[PDB]
Amino acid sequence: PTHLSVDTKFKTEGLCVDIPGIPKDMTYRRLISMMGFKMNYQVNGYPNMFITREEAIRHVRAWIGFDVEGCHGTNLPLQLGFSTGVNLVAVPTPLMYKGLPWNVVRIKIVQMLSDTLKNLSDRVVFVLWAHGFELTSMKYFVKIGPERTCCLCDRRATCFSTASDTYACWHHSIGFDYVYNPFMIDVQQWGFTGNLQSNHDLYCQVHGNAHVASCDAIMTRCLAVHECFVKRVDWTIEYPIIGDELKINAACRKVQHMVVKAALLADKFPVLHDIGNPKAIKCVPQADVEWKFYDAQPCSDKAYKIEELFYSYHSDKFTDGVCLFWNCNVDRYPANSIVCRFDTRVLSNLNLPGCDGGSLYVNKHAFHTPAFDKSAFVNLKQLPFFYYSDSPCESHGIDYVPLKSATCITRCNLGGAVCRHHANEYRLYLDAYNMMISAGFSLWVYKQFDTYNLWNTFT
């Protein structure tokens, strides 16, 4: 069972206010036909417009909440709302656009989806809380058929143009008017009691109902994200490379080793309490310190309470030595800590909007992260950039401009002049550090941390 069978039953109860008299007995096969689409017994890669929850989770980067609200259905104008925040008004003659005929509305839809998704996914998945009008309005902007490739490249086709009779992906669809072979999923098929707002508001106070189609579109995708990534966590699902994933992950490992190695050298803690990933390895394997591990999986709902991670009866005394929370999201870090905390507000192709202020960070695996909270860091300070190295000054083996920097903590800089080797390594480390900060990661440290204490490791 790779795809959702068209002969699967579709509960039509959510649809009978917009569509009175709808048959209770309904399949996807009959529903698609009623939506004005003909699938012609086609075995060409598009078995069903609707997909399973599992296929939706694999394609989370494609999710776009979609809601249609009748302003007045043949004679009435429709308000089309998308989880991008956009509201279009289609006439059959927070961004609010005035009423316009479908032929121009469909051009705006292709532009919006292509700009939102070209750097995220090879498709669109319309996330619905279906009541009727969203499904009946799809014939006005969607064309279906066999799976196709782009006219300008090797990617799959997501748009079609009636002006040129051609197909295009999200990158080459300027001037295209039809969404081609989109996917969709109705959240209302998952067995919920009550309406959209009552189920959304049980888990999220960040999205409100300003009573427009885009507000519902946002709540719909938010509730779908809560169900599939907050209260259900699957870290087995792999996701494609769409940006700087490999460099960001490599930078993270270099910054962790650098920052922990320097903290151990500058303050000589007898013990390190490593709280986080149960699969973690010693990031500074040559350090003299007693390394003690504590398992805690990445929290996807609310941040861990420090009182529950530490208390209720390990050295038992976490106040001895230093605590390392590398992506272990707690409500208030202890004063003796080294912390790496993902900033959920960061704008990037890897970070998708999430539930209750949190975000869905997708890098190889999907990780819903609780909202960034500045108050979690009151006992700590921001960790300044610095590069430390006790490696011998020796070139071995990229042209050179002399490096002058107060943050290159090396024997050569102490002795007056930075050597070529440490200058190349400094600039490579600064690049890795900047990559990690820009990816949304933030670094925090105990208030006594001072890089001045690293110069005396050169005696």
Ligand X SMILES: O=C(CN1CCCC1)Nc1ccc(F)cc1
Hey, which residues are catalytic here? 67, 69, 134, 211, 216
Instruction: State the Cα–Cα distance between residues 292 and 322, nearest whole angstrom.
Output: 11
Rule CB under 5 A: is residue 152 a binding residue for Zn ion?
yes
Instruction: State the Cα–Cα distance between residues 395 and 389, nearest whole angstrom.
Output: 14
Rule CB under 6 A: is residue 136 a binding residue for ligand X?
yes
Judge contact between 82 and 214, C-beta under 8 A.
yes
CA count, 13 A, side-chain hemisphere, 179: 26
What x/- string results for residues 140 through 159 when contact with ligand X is judged by CB under 6 A? --------------------
Closer to ligand X by Cβ: residue 135 or 185:
135
Rule CB under 6 A: is residue 22 a binding residue for ligand X?
yes
Q: Measured from the CB of residue 370, what is the shortest distance to ligand X in angstroms?
A: 38
For 68, residues 6+ apart whose C-beta sits below 8 A from its C-beta are 78, 79, 80, 81, 133, 134, 137, 213
Closer to ligand X by Cβ: residue 135 or 454:
135
* 31 binding partner (options ligand X, Zn ion, none; Cβ < 5 to 8 Å by kind): ligand X
69 is in an annotated binding site: yes
Q: Are strands 166-168 and 95-96 parallel, antiparallel or unpaired?
A: unpaired
Closer to ligand X by Cβ: residue 22 or 437:
22
215 is in an annotated binding site: no
316 is in an annotated binding site: no
Choose which of 4, 31, 128, 322 interacts with ligand X (CB under 6 A).
31
* 48 binding partner (options ligand X, Zn ion, none; Cβ < 5 to 8 Å by kind): none
* 397 binding partner (options Zn ion, ligand X, none; Cβ < 5 to 8 Å by kind): none
Choose which of 31, 124, 157, 169 interacts with Zn ion (CB under 5 A).
169
Residue burial 252-269, b: 16+ Cβ < 10 Å; e: rest: beebbebbbbbbbbbeeb
Cβ neighbours around 392 below 10 Å, total: 11
278 is in an annotated binding site: yes
What x/- string results for residues 116 through 135 when contact with ligand X is judged by CB under 6 A? -------------------x
Listed in order, strand segments (DSSP E) in 306-404 are 322-326, 337-342, 351-353, 359-363, 365-369, 380-382, 387-388
Judge contact between 441 and 340, C-beta under 8 A.
yes
Instruction: Find how far residue 260's CA is from the centre of its chain.
Output: 27
Output the CA angle 320-251-319, nearest 5 degrees.
10
Contact residues: Zn ion, CB under 5 A: 150, 152-153, 155, 169, 171-172, 204, 207, 222, 393, 410, 412, 419, 422
Which residues in this chain contact ligand X in the complex, by CB under 6 A? 19, 21-22, 31, 34-35, 135-136
For the annotated binding site for S-adenosyl-L-methionine, the residues are: 274-280
